[PDB]
Design a protein around this ligand. Structure first.
Ligand SMILES: Cc1ncc(C[n+]2csc(CCOP(=O)(O)OP(=O)(O)O)c2C)c(N)n1
Ligand SMILES: Cc1ncc(C[n+]2csc(CCOP(=O)(O)OP(=O)(O)O)c2C)c(N)n1
Ligand SMILES: [Mg+2]
Ligand SMILES: [Mg+2]
Lengths: 701, 693
C-alpha cells in the first residue's frame, strides 16, 4: 500500500496555514479531498467547466503490448514530447501501470496532462491543484533525486503561467531550470517523470530536445534574461521585416547577482523590450546561505538587502514598471496581477516583484569519503598554524567544501555570490600581497566563465594564486551542462601555470602541500567529483621529508604504477580514472595470446606543466617499449597533445618504431546518467578498455 | 625649429573658456606662460614653496656616455622604474637630449619628475600644470600613437590623485589603463615616453613590471573595482591578523556596463569596503557612441540614461553630487575633504568630464574587416533577415557602415560579451533570421561558458565572426588572439574556418550565408589583405567543393618534405620556401611541398593522405598562427590514429607561436620575436632537415 506515504507527505505539509492564506471554503475543500479522502462521485462536473478527453492510462487493460506502445508513443508526440529521445523501456506497459498507481491518489492531477486539460479546471479551485503538485514532487524527487526546494518555491508561478497564457505560442523562460518540474508535469511529461536524470530519461533541466515547451535550456544561471530578450527581439524583427506573444522570464534573486543577468537587465530596460520579469525573491543567493561568512548569513548582494528593505527602488531607477511585493504562494493575488497583465498589454518593461518561501567489483573500489573532504581537512590543518590563508568561492561554499571553514574562520572566506569573474579577479588582487595565501575554489564548468580572467589577469602577471578545481571529469546525473572535461585542454595552453591532476588522495595531499609551501607559482589542482579510492585498492593495484627534499621530489616527478621477444606497450595515465586502466591490464593478462606476445607497463602522470620527460625516455630508450597508449580523463587537446608533441620534438617514432594510440573522453555531449553509466557511454570503462587495447594490438603487429 | 608645433597645439586648444572656468588671474597666468611666452627669471621661487632637486637633464654635458648612462639608470631606479625591463637604447645620451629639447618648452613640466616634485607646486597654479600636460600629450601621442581623448578626459583626476594622496603607499587603480599617460609622466617615466608601444619600450597600459606605482595591469575593462577591492581586503586582512591607506578606483561609464564591474560594485557596497569610486561620467560607453544603432546615438545602458535616490544611493553608497572633472579647484575641495577626513562608508564621487571638445610590398592598404563589411552589405542588399551584434566594438568589428544604413539590424549591447553571445544565440533559434556575432579574439575569452554551454551544446546555428586573430601588434600581450583554434577546436557541432587571404574569407562568408544548420566561426586576422601580385558555381556544387577541402599551394632520390599551413601566416612559409631552395645542398637532397589547410573541423584527410601515400612525401611540418593545442594537435592525433609515422618512415615537426607573452611591438617585430618570420623559418627548416637525415 502506498497511501501511508501520501499521508506522511501531507503531514509534512503545514495544512493549518491553508485556512489563513486562502479562506474557509478552500481549507474545507483541501481537507475533504486530500485529508479526509472524500472524493465526489461526479467530481469532474464539480471541478471542471468542460469535459476532458482522458489519456490511454485508463484504457490500458484493453491493449496488447505493441498497440499499447504505439498508442502511448502517439500520445506523447501529440503532447509535444520528442519521445524518440527517450528509451522505450521507460514507456512500457509496466511503467505506465506504476505511474497510474501513483496518479490514482490525485483526483485532479490524474486527469490533467496538457495545458488544455489544465484550463478546464475551475479558477476558484486552482489552490487545490497547487496542493496536489506539492505532494507529487514529494513522492517523485524522493525516489529519483534532484533539486527540490526551489521547485516548491515557484510552484504557483509555473502553474499560473500555464493556466493563464497560451504556451508554447507565448515565450516563457526559466533561469537555471532546476525548479521547473511542475512545468514539465503539466506539459505532457508527467508519465515519464519516474525516469528523472537517468540514461535516456528526463533531464533535471529544461531541454530543447525533450519538448517544444522548453524554449531555451540552461544549467548555468543568469541566462534567462538574455535568452528571453533574444526571443522577443527575433519575434519583433520577423514582424518588422514583413507582437501578440507574451514574453516572460522567471529569474531568482541569486541569478540576478551574476554579471550577465545584470547586463541583460540593463539592456532590456534600455531597449524597452515588452518583457515581464518575474523577480522571484526567496532570500537565497548562494548554496547555501545560512552558513556564516565574513559578511554574515545575509544574502549576498546590495540589491538583495535593498529589495528586502523595500518590501524609487533599483528597478524604478532603471526605468522599469514595478508592481509591488506580491505573494508568490497566493494563487488569488498572483492570478489577479497576471490576469490584468494578460487582459491589458505591457507598454514598457515590467518587473513583478514576488516574495516566496524555500525552507517552509566496481563498488568495492571506492569508499564513502570524497576528495573534497580531504581538501577541507588539509586546509583546516594548514589554517591551524597559519591564519593568512584566504578562501573564495562563487556561491558554492557547500560544494567546494568551504562551509566547514566559513563556520570556524568566517573572516577567511569571501562568498561573492555567483561572481566567477569577480571571484577570480578579486582573488588575484588579493594574491599580490606576499603576506597572504589565497586559494580559490571553483568548479570545472564554472571556470569556463572566468577563463579570460585566468589568462589576462592571472597568467600574464604571474600572480601566485592557487585555484582549486572541483567536479573534474565526469560529474554524473547533472548532465552535459555540468561536464568538467575542459580543464587540461584550456589550462595547458598557458605558461606560468602549474597543473596537477591527482588520481588518488595521496597525490592530492602532495599537490596541496606544494601549493601551501609554494610562493612563486600559480598552481591549479584538479579534484575529481569522485570518492577516494580504497586502501585495499591502493595497496593491491597502485602498489603504494623536509621542505626542500619534498619540493625537489614532487615537481615533474611522475609515479610508476606497473613496470620470441614480446612487444612492450606502455600506457601513460593522466587524470582520475586510472582504476579503469589497472583493471583492464589485470584482465588482459588472463588470455594466453596477449600474455605470450606482449608485455605492459603503466606510468601515472600527475603533471601537465612541466611534464616528466625523464619517465617517458626511461620507458622509451632504456627498457625499449614498443607501443605507447595515452589515457586521459579529459577531452581532446589535453595530455595527448603534450605527449604527441614531445615525441614529435624528438622524433622517437622513427628512432624506436613506436605505434601510438590515445584514449580520452569523447567530444560528444555526455548526457545525464550515473557515473558508471557515463564511463560505459564513452567506452572508457574496463571492458571497453580491454576491447580497445586488444583491437589495437591485433591490428598493428 | 619646434616652436611652430607648440603654436599649432595652442591654437588647437580652446583657451578662451579658461577665463570663465577658472578666473581672470589664472587666465592671465596661462596666457603669459603658454601664449605670450613670458617666462620670468626666478619663476621657481614664484611657483614653488620649496626648492627642487633637478635631474641629470641639466648636467648632461658634463658626462661621457658610460657615466651618463649609469647616472640615468640610477635616476630611473630611484624614481621607481624597473629599468631592466626597458632596452638600454631608450635611455642613451641622444634620447635624453631629445627629451630635454622637448621639455625645455614646458616651464613647469621640465622641473617635475616625481610626486615629491609635484607637491612643491602651489595649489593655485595646479591648473597651469594641468595645461602643460595637455600640450605634452598632444605632442607625444601624436608621434608614438595610442589612446588620446580618454587621457585628456581624466587628466585632472590623475593630476589631483598624485598631488593630494601618498602614492604608492595609497592604492589607486584605473580601469583599462589606456587613459593613464599623465600618471606615467609624473611617476618617473616621462623621459622614456618617446618609446611608447614599441619593442622593449613603455606600454600603452599600466604594467606591474614597469613601476611600483602600477598596482594592477589592465587592458580588459570592468577589472578596476574587483582589483581595488582585493587590495583593500588584503590590506584589511593583514592588519586584522596582526587601514591608513586610501583605496581609490577610477572607472568610467563604459566600464561599469560590463558584468564583472556591476558585480564588483554590488559586492563593494555589500561588504562596506572603504573604497572611493570615481565614476568618470563622460557620455561614452562603446567605441564609438555617435554611431546610429537600433537605439540611435544614445549611450548604451539604463544606468547611462539614469545619470547622463539614484542607483548608487539605492545600493547604499555615499554619493557626492555631480562634480566637474575639468575644474581643479572644485575637485581639489572634494578630494581634500576626503583626505583630511576619512571614508566611514563606501562612496561614489560622481564626476562629469568631456570627451569631444619585400615585406611591405606583399600587403595592400585594405583590411580583411573591410572585405567582411562589403560582403555582409552585399548580402544584406538581397536579404534583410541578417542580424549583427557586437560588444561595444562597432567600429573595430566593421559594423558601423551596417548600423548607419540598417540601424534596426545592429544591436550594440555595450561591453556585454556574455550578453552578446547568449542574446545572439537565442536570436538564432529563429529559423527566419540569420545572426552573425562580431567579436574580437581576446574578448571572446570572456564568452566561453556560453559558447560551450549555450551555443554548441544546443547546436544553435549561430555564425560568429572573430576579429583580431593571431598577432595584433602594439596593443600588447593583453590583446593577443592566439587561442582561437586551441579553444574552438574542442567543439563538436562547430565548423571553424581560418582564411589566409581574402578569397578564402569570401568563401567562408558565402558558406555561412548559405548554411542554415551549422555553427560557423570565421577567423579574420588583424592584417591587411595580400597583394594580388603575391597570389599570382551553384549552391550545391559550391557547398560540396568547399567544406573540408584544403587547397594545394605547391606540389640519390630526394627526400620530400610537406608543410601543412593553418591560419594567416602563409606568406612567411611561401617566402621561406622560395629562399631555402637557393642553397645547393637542400635543392639537391630535398624537395618541398606546401598544403594550405582552411578547416579545423572537418579536416581534409584526403589531401593529407594524398601527400602521405600518393606522392610519397617523407617529412611533415605544421605551421600555424596559434599557440599549442591547435592544428598541431589534430594533425599529430590523426597521424597517431592511422599510425602513419611508424609504417611509412615519417619525421614530424611543428611551428607555432610561442607560449610566452608577446609584448607590445610592431607586427613585423612580433613575427621576428617568436622566430616565425621568413629568415627564422629558413633557419629552423634547415636545422630540422640537417639534424634528422
Ligand atoms: C552560473 C552558475 N553559477 C553557479 C551555479 C550554482 N547554483 C545553483 S543554485 C544557485 C543559487 C540559486 O539562486 P536563485 O537564482 O535564487 O535560485 P532559487 O534558489 O530561487 O531556485 C547556485 C549558485 C549555477 N547554477 N550557475
Ligand atoms: C572587456 C573589454 N571589452 C571591450 C573593450 C574595448 N573598449 C575599449 S574603449 C571601450 C569603452 C571605454 O568606456 P569608458 O570606460 O567610459 O572609457 P573612457 O572612454 O572613459 O576612456 C571599450 C568597449 C575593452 N577594452 N575591454
Ligand atoms: Mg534564492
Ligand atoms: Mg566613456
Amino acid at each position: 500500500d502506498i497511501g501511508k506515504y501520501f499521508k506522511q507527505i501531507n503531514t509534512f505539509i503545514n495544512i493549518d496555514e491553508y485556512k489563513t492564506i486562502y479562506g474557509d471554503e478552500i481549507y474545507k475543500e483541501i481537507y475533504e479531498l486530500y485529508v479526509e479522502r472524500n472524493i465526489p462521485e461526479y467530481y469532474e462536473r464539480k471541478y471542471f467547466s468542460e469535459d476532458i478527453k482522458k489519456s490511454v492510462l485508463f484504457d490500458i487493460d484493453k491493449y496488447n503490448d505493441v498497440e499499447f506502445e504505439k498508442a502511448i508513443k502517439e500520445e506523447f508526440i501529440n503532447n509535444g514530447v520528442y519521445i524518440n529521445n527517450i528509451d522505450n523501456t521507460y514507456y512500457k506497459k509496466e511503467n505506465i501501470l506504476i505511474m497510474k498507481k501513483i496518479l490514482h491518489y490525485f483526483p485532479l492531477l490524474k486527469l490533467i496532462n496538457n495545458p488544455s486539460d489544465l484550463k478546464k479546471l475551475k479558477k476558484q479551485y486552482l489552490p487545490l491543484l497547487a496542493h496536489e503538485l506539492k505532494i507529487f514532487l514529494f513522492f517523485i524527487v524522493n525516489i529519483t533525486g534532484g533539486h527540490f526546494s526551489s521547485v516548491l518555491s515557484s510552484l504557483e508561478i509555473q502553474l499560473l503561467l500555464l493556466y493563464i497564457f497560451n504556451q508554447p505560442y507565448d515565450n516563457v523562460i526559466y533561469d537555471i531550470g532546476h525548479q521547473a518540474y511542475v512545468h514539465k508535469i503539466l506539459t505532457g511529461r508527467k508519465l515519464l517523470f519516474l525516469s528523472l536524470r537517468n540514461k535516456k530519461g528526463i533531464s533535471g533541466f529544461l531541454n530543447i530536445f525533450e519538448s517544444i515547451y522548453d524554449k531555451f535550456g540552461a544549467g548555468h544561471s543568469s541566462t534567462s534574461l538574455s535568452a528571453i530578450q533574444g526571443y522577443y527581439e527575433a519575434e519583433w524583427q520577423v514582424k518588422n521585416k514583413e507582437v501578440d506573444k507574451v514574453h516572460i522570464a522567471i529569474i531568482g534573486d541569486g541569478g540576478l547577482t551574476g554579471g550577465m543577468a545584470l547586463e541583460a537587465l540593463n539592456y532590456i530596460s534600455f531597449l524597452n523590450s515588452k518583457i515581464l520579469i518575474i523577480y522571484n525573491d526567496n532570500g537565497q543567493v548562494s548554496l547555501p546561505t545560512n552558513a556564516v561568512s565574513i559578511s554574515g548569513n545575509r544574502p549576498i548582494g546590495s540589491i538583495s538587502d535593498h529589495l528586502h528593505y523595500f518590501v524609487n527602488n533599483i528597478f524604478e531607477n532603471l526605468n522599469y514598471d514595478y508592481i509591488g511585493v506580491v505573494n508568490g504562494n497566493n494563487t488569488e493575488e498572483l492570478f489577479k496581477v497576471l490576469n490584468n497583465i494578460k487582459e491589458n498589454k505591457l507598454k514598457r518593461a515590467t518587473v513583478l516583484h514576488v516574495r516566496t518561501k524555500k525552507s517552509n567489483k566496481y563498488e568495492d573500489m571506492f569508499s564513502k569519503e570524497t576528495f573534497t573532504d580531504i581538501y577541507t581537512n588539509e586546509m583546516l590543518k594548514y589554517l591551524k598554524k597559519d591564519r593568512n590563508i584566504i578562501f573564495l568561492s562563487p556561491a558554492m561554499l557547500g560544494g567546494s567544501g568551504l562551509v566547514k571553514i566559513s563556520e570556524r574562520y568566517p573572516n577567511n572566506v569571501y562568498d561573492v555570490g555567483i561572481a566567477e569573474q569577480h571571484s577570480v579577479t578579486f582573488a588575484a588582487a588579493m594574491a599580490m600581497n606576499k603576506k597572504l595565501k589565497i586559494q580559490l575554489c571553483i568548479y570545472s564548468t564554472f571556470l569556463q566563465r572566468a577563463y579570460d580572467q585566468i589568462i589576462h589577469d592571472l597568467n600574464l602577471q604571474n600572480i601566485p594564486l592557487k585555484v582549486i578545481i572541483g567536479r573534474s571529469g565526469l560529474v554524473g546525473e547533472d548532465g552535459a551542462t555540468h561536464q568538467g572535461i575542459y580543464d587540461l585542454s584550456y589550462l595547458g595552453t598557458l605558461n606560468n601555470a602549474y597543473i596537477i591532476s591527482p588520481s588518488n588522495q595521496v597525490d592530492l595531499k602532495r599537490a596541496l602541500r606544494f601549493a601551501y609551501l609554494d610562493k612563486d607559482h600559480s598552481v591549479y589542482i584538479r579534484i575529481p567529483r569522485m570518492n577516494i579510492l580504497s586502501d585495499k585498492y591502493m595497496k593491491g593495484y597502485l602498489n603504494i621529508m623536509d621542505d626542500d627534499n619534498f619540493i625537489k621530489s614532487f615537481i615533474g616527478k611522475s609515479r610508476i604504477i606497473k613496470m620470441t621477444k614480446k612487444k612492450k606497450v606502455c600506457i601513460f595515465n593522466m587524470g582520475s580514472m586510472l582504476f579503469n586502466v589497472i583493471n583492464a591490464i589485470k584482465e588482459i593478462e588472463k588470455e594466453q595470446y596477449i600474455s605470450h606476445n606482449y608485455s605492459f607497463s603503466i606510468v601515472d602522470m600527475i603533471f601537465l606543466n612541466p611534464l616528466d620527460k625523464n619517465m617517458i625516455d626511461h620507458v622509451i630508450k632504456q627498457n625499449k617499449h614498443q607501443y605507447l597508449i595515452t589515457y586521459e580523463d579529459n577531452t581532446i587537446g589535453g595530455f595527448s597533445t603534450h605527449f604527441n608533441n614531445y615525441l614529435i620534438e624528438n622524433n622517437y617514432i622513427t628512432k624506436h618504431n613506436l605505434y601510438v594510440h590515445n584514449i580520452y573522453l569523447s567530444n560528444e555531449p555526455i548526457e545525464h546518467a550515473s557515473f558508471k553509466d557515463q564511463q560505459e557511454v564513452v567506452k572508457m570503462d574496463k571492458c571497453s578498455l580491454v576491447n580497445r587495447i586488444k583491437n589495437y594490438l591485433k591490428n598493428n603487429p
